Amino acid sequence: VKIYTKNGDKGQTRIIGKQILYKNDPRVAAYGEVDELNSWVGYTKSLINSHTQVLSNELEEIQQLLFDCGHDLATPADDERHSFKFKQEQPTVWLEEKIDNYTQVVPAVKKFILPGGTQLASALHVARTITRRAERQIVQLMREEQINQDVLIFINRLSDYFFAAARYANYLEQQPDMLYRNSKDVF
Template sequence: MKIYTKTGDKGQTSIIGGEKVMKCSDRVVAYGTIDELNSYVGVIISQMKSSPDMKKDLVEIQQILFDCGTDMATPNSSKGYRTDAASTTWLEECVDKYLASPPLLKEFILPGGDPIAAQLHMARTIARRAERLVVATAMEEEINEEVLKFLNRLSDYFFAAARLINFREGRSDVSYRRNSQVFYN
């Protein structure tokens, strides 16, 4: 089986339903960035040597990200969407569970610490970029709004996961030096 089709040689691709769009369209750039994020999560998982609970959650996130990408490649709801509110609710539960261990934050912190935590912070920024691209698509076309909600919560998840990894590995958060108290718990 050949995996190349040559149909994209002129800068077009087919989305679900057969419509041809330019590869630089907001929709294609959005689901391409979701795919990039999914791949980066795979890199993180491949390097994790501890935290099997988080590793399991990250694999589930990969599954949901694949659904998000499929939904973004679907131009209207008549074809049926895959991402639902339950995915976001589950992610919120993970965030709450992860934030129960590290000390409460009162100010901004710098991304970094343990190598896995640093990669989770990088995933957070990719999730934010994907979210912005989904918003750009939603301004022009119909999308599954659950994808936008999930991506918004996903950046929070990666932040909480990075903090938990640093906490588990005995790494302290590094405060931004020009901080003032910004979080009031």
Template sequence: MKIYTKTGDKGMTKLVGGAQVSKDSDRVESYGTVDELNSWVGYAISMLPKEQEEVKAELKQVQQFLFDVGTDLATPVETERPAKLQSESITWLEARIDVYTAEAPDIERFILPGGSPEASMMHVARTIARRAERSIVRLSWTAKLNENVVMFVNRLSDYFYALARTLNVRAKESDVFYERSEKVFHNIKKDGL
């Protein structure tokens, strides 16, 4: 099986359903950024220590959801194919965020990304998720999308943030607060991000 098709040699690609678009379109930028995030999560899984098997399994589930997101973004709604990403994925993420938020101490100020290597990888994932969200929102102004996609990716950056803080707690690494931060969170566990 050949993996090259030569259809992209002139800067075009095909979406699910056969429509052709430019490789620099908002749609391709969106699902490309989601693919980048999925690849980063795969890298993070490979770097997590064996004692984090539960987190690794959870991140593999996140990868499955990200593939659903990418498929939905690559499938124009006009093709009338059923959406892959369902609202249950958002409920699942929110439950995981709640678990991790309960495990980390309350904070009132911004923290710097970092800490343990595992937490640092989750902070990188958080920022890629935010970039993906910006791309998807930009696309949503001109194309109809599965409404679960924007909500899921929005929650996903919160998930990576909460997981990063928990991984620091487990590694006995303290959060490093932004020195000039005002108090911005009243109760992180109650109010979220």
């Protein structure tokens, strides 16, 4: 069992189906960024402590879902042998319910908050911004190729989820958020 094949040593790689692409191809960058986000979520999850245990399982669930998203990003729309498996509806409503809940419980802001606080809150804000980076790359891809737009919907909602969860993480250890001192009332 050798995970190193050396077939990518020249800069090309396989996607789902028969096609090979350069590794800097927008498709390969898109699910590559999703994989980096997925790894960061894993890292975020490893920071869970006794105060924040309630967040542990949904972070693991998000990791499962990112694999589902990345599958589809790796799959060309005109591939006869492989289909899109990701449906946005239920995973996205599930995120929305959490955003709603977490928004309700934490103290309300007007203004932008400093992305920080506890180590977990801060990690969740990093997740937020990696998701948004990945989102940009999915959009780059979408502008050149037919994608499963359900993936975009979910990844879009996901960075709102990370924002909500990060505030909730602060709430769980009673760490106050700090406001951006020059913020207008934006929320």
